[PDB]
Design a protein around this nucleic acid. Sequence first.
DNA 1: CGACCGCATTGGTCAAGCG
DNA 2: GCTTGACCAATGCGGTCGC
Length: 85
Amino acid sequence: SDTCEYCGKVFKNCSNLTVHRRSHTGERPYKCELCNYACAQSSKLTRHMKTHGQVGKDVYKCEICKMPFSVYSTLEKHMKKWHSD
DNA sequence: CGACCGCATTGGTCAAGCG
DNA sequence: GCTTGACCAATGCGGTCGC
Ligand SMILES: [Zn+2]
Ligand SMILES: [Zn+2]
Ligand SMILES: [Zn+2]
């Protein structure tokens, strides 16, 4: 009840197995409300949420896409990939 | 051009810690 | 049992530099 049905890795914390398993089945239920980011770990999505704005720092929003960033240096990454026009 | 180099972000991993 | 976050390496970029 603790081993991966797909490759047989053995987990002593079974919750680790339920997350690992999605590496095979591709399920990504933790979906960001701010972008199309998704992941198989609740931990990761909250960590990714920092990238959308810190509490004490000035936030940067996409002028086209209303999307908020905390660091400018990844906004234009979103400009190039999503706003080529 | 190609190969280095700093950074913001990430995927994988793990297990303390809970009460 | 289950959540949470630290850790690490990988990534990808943008830029730099190289008998
Ligand atoms: Zn597996
Ligand atoms: Zn997001
Ligand atoms: Zn945008």
